[PDB]
């Protein structure tokens, strides 16, 4: 039953090791890799992943000398795919390049000649920010639970107390929220989904009592699951292939699970592999870093901000506020706010949220907001 | 200046030589080829392309006997890269294949021995529809519009008119909108983007000059073009280097494009390259069926729809039904409605929707919604 008022929304996550996550872990290992050389490095690299292949797409104009071989299987490594028998192994399978130059005529049209502050934008594109305060961490309920899923079962991968997990996972949660004045407010869990891949002994039930006991028990607050909460944990019944093995994986594939999981809304762009002249990460993040603090700054509980730009063109082409209600200020008021408080031109984002640190590979799993205190996650002190 | 109650949203498209909706492209002539010898054919084809390279990785299990080399370079044909002057050349690029069969762990958990109208979802996950009735089509004015700025310039390039066109491009609309009852209403077009690939002679000023009196003029109308409407025409300056040469493409990366335009909601699973019993794309087809159906039913004048599922498992987790205050109706009345009328099962959503239907190609430029009748397209009258 659901109460007048009151409504459902689902969010969903992955684990390290889903195919989609690995390529972009890789191509952000790869991003950070030209970083800790070249902090002006040029970078748009795709990863591919499908059974034995890691393949690097895209283009990079960099100073940098990377060993390509080593940064992605140091990757690969790192998420736990280290052996045959889990169907995938860094220290055997393929890697492959395919990497040029920057074209020269996005250089020249983007950043050639051009002072720092006004290189233009990288492409066009649009972007979206939003925060909500129904967590202190200004993230969505949904998807906040849903990543935790998935984090805590490569917790317990890797601390060998189910060590039948392997590391594909995929999570998905759905809450029942009351609305309050354009804000909402968590009530329930409604249902939750898990898949991991596991080894070829483990059975069925040892496996969702695992998940129910040890997973969900370990991560949702009691008072949200009740009699009536629906759990699907290896709905598919088994799950022993998996990885690129299972379904291939690309860059780019999960821009919902790395944003909001469906709330707010979400411009398209992919965020993995990419310096910060590429708007589709860093004007996102700046978007963010405005929708947080203008919550944080106590003049809204929920807010959706979009931006948009042209390549070539430093200042984005508009700015939008939406506050689903919960400002006393117009949305004109909070847009003089947010202009009189933030430059959002990728020259000025980048030395406001340090956008040339090689920090990008841990932004590549459970999301790239809401945690860690990354620079768009620290609110500004707003003036006005 | 922005009166209250009016704001500004903006959406994006791309044109059939982009290098991601390549990729969308091959993917579907895959799927379409497979179909036209086995509809039953399991199909996860996703596409990579970067200079001189098609690859294509995935899942595929399927009784057609399918010439990968002659779909993908007809396919490039059609898009019109066809001489190493434009940068890809049909006649002479690689075409690789890193295909295997569909898991069997997978197989067995979704349709293995299953009845079709019992056949659980292809994975987990999240999807929405949407509907505005201020188009005809019921498609926000602000996609509409830049897909048909791409769809001209397809247009006047084959047409031998500007023959100085190449086929990758990339368009951008922000329209400002009037508030009307929880529905919107175009007021005014603030910017427009056009990047378009060219040839080596054109100069600048020719291209600008083009790309208003005939592209802008021919689809935008006067109406909504005023002396403060902003144009940014080949803002980087020069585009001779494009489609996958000058951008890796790959399926899937182009979503929003697929969908709404940033408007509804995005549950971020790609169309192109998969069969029915995925439901990243059935179950969205469904559900912007279901949101047509309530608006052109006149229920609703704007209304988003959220599904979701757990692979293998063939009912919907749930399903809601957001009105933006523009039904008389309350939700849980607009869901009995849904529920009584629409079965989202995806062995039913295929019958009803005929996708084991070979035209999955034609969806894969200019957005999946909107355009041609397409079964998703032909509301269904409603009983209640
Ligand atoms: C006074 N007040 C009214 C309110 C209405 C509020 N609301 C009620 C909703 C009810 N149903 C659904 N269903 C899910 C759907 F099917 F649409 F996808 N979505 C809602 C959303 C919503 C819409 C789009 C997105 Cl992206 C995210 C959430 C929403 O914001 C919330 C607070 C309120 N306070
Ligand atoms: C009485 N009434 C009130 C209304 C408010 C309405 N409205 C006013 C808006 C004002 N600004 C923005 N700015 C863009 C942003 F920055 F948010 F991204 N978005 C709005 C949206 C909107 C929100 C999320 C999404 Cl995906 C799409 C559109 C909206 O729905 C529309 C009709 C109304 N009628
Ligand atoms: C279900 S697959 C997508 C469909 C697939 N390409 C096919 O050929 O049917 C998407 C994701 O689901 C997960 N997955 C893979 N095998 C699975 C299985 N046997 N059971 C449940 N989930 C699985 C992995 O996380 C994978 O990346
Ligand atoms: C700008 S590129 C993305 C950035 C690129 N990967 C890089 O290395 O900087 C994205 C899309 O923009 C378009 N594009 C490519 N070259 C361009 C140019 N010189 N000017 C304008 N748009 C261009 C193509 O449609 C391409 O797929
Ligand atoms: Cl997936
Ligand atoms: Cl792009």
Redesign the pocket.
């Known amino acids: 039953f659901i109460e007048e008022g009151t409504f459902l929304f689902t969010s969903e996550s992955v684990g390290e090791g889903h195919p989609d996550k690995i390529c972009d872990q890789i191509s952000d290992a790869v991003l950070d890799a030209h970083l800790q050389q070249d902090p002006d490095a040029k970078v748009a690299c795709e990863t591919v992943a499908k059974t034995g292949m890691i393949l690097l797409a895209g283009e990079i104009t960099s100073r940098a000398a990377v060993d390509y071989q080593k940064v992605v299987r140091e990757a690969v490594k790192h998420i736990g795919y280290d052996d045959s028998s889990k169907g995938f192994d860094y220290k055997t399978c393929n890697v492959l390049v395919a990497l040029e130059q920057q074209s020269p005529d996005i250089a020249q049209g983007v950043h050639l000649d051009r002072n720092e502050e006004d290189i233009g934008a990288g492409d066009q594109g649009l972007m979206?920010g939003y925060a909500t305060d129904e967590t202190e961490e200004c993230m969505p309920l949904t998807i906040v639970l849903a990543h935790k899923l998935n984090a805590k079962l490569a917790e317990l991968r890797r601390n060998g107390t189910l060590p039948w997990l392997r590391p594909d996972s995929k999570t998905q949660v759905t809450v029942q929220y009351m609305q309050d004045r354009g804000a909402v407010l968590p009530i329930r869990v409604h249902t939750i989904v898990i898949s991991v891949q596991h080894d070829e002994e483990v059975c069925l039930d040892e496996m969702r009592d695992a998940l129910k006991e040890k997973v969900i028990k370990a991560v949702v607050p009691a008072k949200y699951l009740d009699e009536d909460t629906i759990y699907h944990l290896q709905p598919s019944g088994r799950f022993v292939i998996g990885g690129p093995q299972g379904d291939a994986g690309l860059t780019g594939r999960k821009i919902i699970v790395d944003t909001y999981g469906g709330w707010?809304?979400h411009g398209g762009g992919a965020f993995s592999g990419k310096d910060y002249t590429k708007v589709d990460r860093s004007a996102a993040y700046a978007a963010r870093w405005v929708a947080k603090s203008l919550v944080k700054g106590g003049l809204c509980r929920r807010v959706?901000?979009?931006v948009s730009y042209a390549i070539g063109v430093s200042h984005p082409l508009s700015i939008?506020?939406?506050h689903y209600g919960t400002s006393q200020k117009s949305?004109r008021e909070l847009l003089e706010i947010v202009k009189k408080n933030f430059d959002l031109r990728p020259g000025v984002i980048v030395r406001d949220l340090d956008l040339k640190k090689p920090i990008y590979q841990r932004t590549a799993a459970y999301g790239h907001f809401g945690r860690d205190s990354f620079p768009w996650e620290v609110p500004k002190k707003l003036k006005y």
Chains 1, 2 share one sequence.
């Open positions: 979206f707010g809304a959706l901000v979009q939008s506020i939406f949305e």
